[PDB]
């Protein structure tokens, strides 16, 4: 799975937030029956949030109900819509808001068998399905130009006309843009095949590895920075995370992992098994961030494999033990290769470190169906070719 | 209208639960002595 | 053959080589004792009536009590066809597994189907050091 | 029960329709005449 037990409370309380504060747009309805249906939907919600919040309260129902009502955990508009109506509706819905959640609180609960976390699930499932567009970003612009520089072509597409263009960016579908009406949209690109980007004052502009190109402007630089900064991220999450796009909004963080090589939280086996596929000789060492603390990197040494970690305060680098300190990583670990290291019995001298190589598979990467098919094909052992008949040839001068 | 109409809502039934990773197990050693040549 | 469309046999005359003399019988689609047969440039269609059993060309007063029987009986002689005049010589069968409107695609047949190589060779390599030579 | 529940059957909506094959189109030559050698 993706992300871990830490994680999910805090983005269920993000959706619960989300979804209270009615800063995510609600899915407007197609009729008046699925009309009815959102807002039984949206009070089933409701009940499936107190339930979360009793059984995390550790007290059934009645120990506690002066608490209780449902406004506050529905969307404000629906709040006032449903205050503009008449009182019996209002009993009615109260009474069956109470019958479906004494009937969830005590029944479902022995005939599902459920959890806290079991509820978790669905209630980010269902808050997904039902609003619109949900987890997406949307720009709108003035002006949007494509083009191509196909052979002899140099392709100017678009026109220069009045006309406002939107631009929508998700993991799960790439780049897309379309036409505002007074329409499905059409694929660009997706991040792994984008080759770099290049900012000017206001003006966004992306290529792509065919050679080619489309460049927008927005009102404002800092805009432009937060969208660069989504692709980067995006590339990074699915292409390549020792890498970024744009030196303007470069984190400092990885600038200095390249500049000294240094791996991130990548599992034991990994490098275990990347020291195996080098030599596995006397004097290597692999150096990635603790998957558990923030201040310590260890390295991997290698037939034995010794691990060593390191302490890194306020910029300050030392080696745990030792009293002495270092201003630099790169002044640290110099430092100590002029010297013999005892190991119990086995003494040993690094000799050369390991670096990172291109979209090198590990447990960072998120594997997706879309990017599956960009996995590059097995041939360790294929040749294939077409003959050409001699017959369909004419031979010339040298 | 809605007084003739009862129906539970559709979102109250599940199956095939769900799974996240609990956690990483923590483990390390630490045995260096150094010396010069 | 049987109710096949008129486009696929017309088809099967251009792939053996369209020569005057050969011919193609396949049932009528409409009509259930009616056998037509296309023969071939000039593609002429001619149809023969089957009834009890008994078989004889239209528009002629005899009659055969075979198909082979009638078919032969026409070997022997010349055709006239407004201007042009010819003489069949050879008939057309069946091929397996041939493709027709008679076939019904369905996603598991898919599968089956045969794959396109003909113009590719694939093969693997065997290291010289992998291998140990031995006695003729 | 029933009495409190009612909604239109779900066979009941229409979308993208159908359509079968028509017919084959009746055509068919006759001009034989025939002569020995």
């Given at each position: 799975?993706?992300?871990?037990?830490?994680?999910?409370?805090?983005?269920?309380?993000?959706?619960?937030?989300?979804?209270?504060?009615?800063?995510?747009?609600?899915?407007?309805?197609?009729?008046?029956?699925?009309?009815?249906?959102?807002?039984?939907?949206?009070?089933?919600?409701?009940?499936l949030?107190?339930?979360?919040?009793?059984?995390?309260?550790?007290?059934?129902?009645?120990?506690?109900?002066?608490?209780?009502?449902?406004?506050?955990?529905?969307?404000?508009?629906?709040?006032?819509?449903?205050?503009?109506?008449?009182?019996?509706?209002?009993?009615?819905?109260?009474?069956?808001?109470?019958?479906?959640?004494?009937?969830?609180?005590?029944?479902t609960?022995?005939d599902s068998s459920v959890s806290?976390h079991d509820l978790k699930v669905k209630y980010?499932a269902t808050?997904?399905t039902?609003?619109?567009?949900?987890?997406?970003?949307?720009?709108?612009?003035?002006?949007?130009?494509?083009?191509?520089?196909?052979?002899?072509?140099?392709?100017?597409?678009?026109?220069?006309?009045?006309?406002?263009?939107?631009?929508?960016?998700?993991?799960?579908?790439?780049?897309?843009?379309?036409?505002?009406?007074?329409?499905?949209?059409?694929?660009?690109?997706?991040?792994?095949?984008?080759?770099?980007?290049?900012?000017?004052?206001?003006?966004?502009?992306?290529?792509?590895?065919?050679?080619?190109?489309?460049?927008?402007?927005?009102?404002?630089?800092?805009?432009?920075?937060?969208?660069?900064?989504?692709?980067?991220?995006?590339?990074?999450?699915?292409?390549?995370?020792?890498?970024?796009?744009?030196?303007?909004?470069?984190?400092?963080?990885?600038?200095?992992?390249?500049?000294?090589?240094?791996?991130?939280?990548?599992?034991?086996?990994?490098?275990?098994?990347?020291?195996?596929?080098?030599?596995?000789?006397?004097?290597?060492?692999?150096?990635?961030?603790?998957?558990?603390?923030?201040?310590?990197?260890?390295?991997?040494?290698?037939?034995?494999?010794?691990?060593?970690?390191?302490?890194?305060?306020?910029?300050?680098?030392?080696?745990?033990?030792?009293?002495?300190?270092?201003?630099?990583?790169?002044?640290?670990?110099?430092?100590?290769?002029?010297?013999?290291?005892?190991?119990?019995?086995?003494?040993?001298?690094?000799?050369?470190?390991?670096?990172?190589?291109?979209?090198?598979?590990?447990?960072?990467?998120?594997?997706?169906?879309?990017?599956?098919?960009?996995?590059?094909?097995?041939?360790?052992?294929?040749?294939?070719?077409?003959?050409?008949?001699?017959?369909?040839?004419?031979?010339?001068?040298? | 209208?809605?007084?003739?109409?009862?129906?539970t809502p559709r979102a109250l039934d599940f199956s095939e639960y769900r799974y996240?990773?609990?956690?990483?197990?923590?483990?390390?050693?630490?045995?260096?002595?150094?010396?010069?040549?």
């Amino acid at each position: 799975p993706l992300l871990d037990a830490s994680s999910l409370e805090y983005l269920f309380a993000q959706g619960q937030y989300d979804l209270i504060k009615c800063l995510a747009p609600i899915r407007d309805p197609k009729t008046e029956q699925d009309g009815h249906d959102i807002e039984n939907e949206c009070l089933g919600m409701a009940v499936l949030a107190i339930s979360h919040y009793a059984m995390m309260k550790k007290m059934q129902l009645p120990e506690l109900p002066k608490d209780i009502s449902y406004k506050r955990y529905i969307p404000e508009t629906l709040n006032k819509s449903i205050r503009q109506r008449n009182l019996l509706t209002r009993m009615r819905i109260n009474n069956v808001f109470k019958d479906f959640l004494k009937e969830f609180n005590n029944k479902t609960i022995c005939d599902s068998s459920v959890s806290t976390h079991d509820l978790k699930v669905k209630y980010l499932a269902t808050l997904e399905t039902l609003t619109k567009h949900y987890g997406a970003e949307i720009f709108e612009t003035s002006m949007l130009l494509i083009s191509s520089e196909n052979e002899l072509s140099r392709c100017h597409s678009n026109d220069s006309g009045n006309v406002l263009y939107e631009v929508m960016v998700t993991g799960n579908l790439g780049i897309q843009w379309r036409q505002k009406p007074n329409e499905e949209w059409n694929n660009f690109s997706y991040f792994p095949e984008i080759t770099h980007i290049v900012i000017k004052e206001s003006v966004v502009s992306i290529n792509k590895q065919d050679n080619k190109n489309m460049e927008l402007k927005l009102s404002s630089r800092e805009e432009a920075l937060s969208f660069v900064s989504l692709v980067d991220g995006y590339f990074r999450l699915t292409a390549d995370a020792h890498h970024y796009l744009c030196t303007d909004v470069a984190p400092p963080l990885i600038v200095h992992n390249i500049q000294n090589g240094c791996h991130g939280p990548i599992c034991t086996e990994y490098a275990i098994n990347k020291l195996r596929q080098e030599g596995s000789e006397e004097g290597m060492y692999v150096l990635r961030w603790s998957c558990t603390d923030f201040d310590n990197i260890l390295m991997t040494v290698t037939k034995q494999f010794k691990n060593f970690q390191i302490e890194v305060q306020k910029g300050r680098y030392s080696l745990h033990g030792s009293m002495d300190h270092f201003p630099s990583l790169r002044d640290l670990m110099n430092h100590l290769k002029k010297q013999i290291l005892r190991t119990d019995n086995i003494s040993f001298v690094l000799k050369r470190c390991c670096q990172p190589k291109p979209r090198e598979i590990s447990n960072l990467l998120v594997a997706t169906k879309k990017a599956q098919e960009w996995q590059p094909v097995y041939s360790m052992s294929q040749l294939s070719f077409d003959r050409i008949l001699k017959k369909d040839i004419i031979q010339g001068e040298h | 209208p809605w007084f003739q109409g009862v129906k539970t809502p559709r979102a109250l039934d599940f199956s095939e639960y769900r799974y996240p990773v609990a956690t990483f197990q923590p483990s390390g050693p630490e045995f260096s002595d150094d010396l010069i040549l």
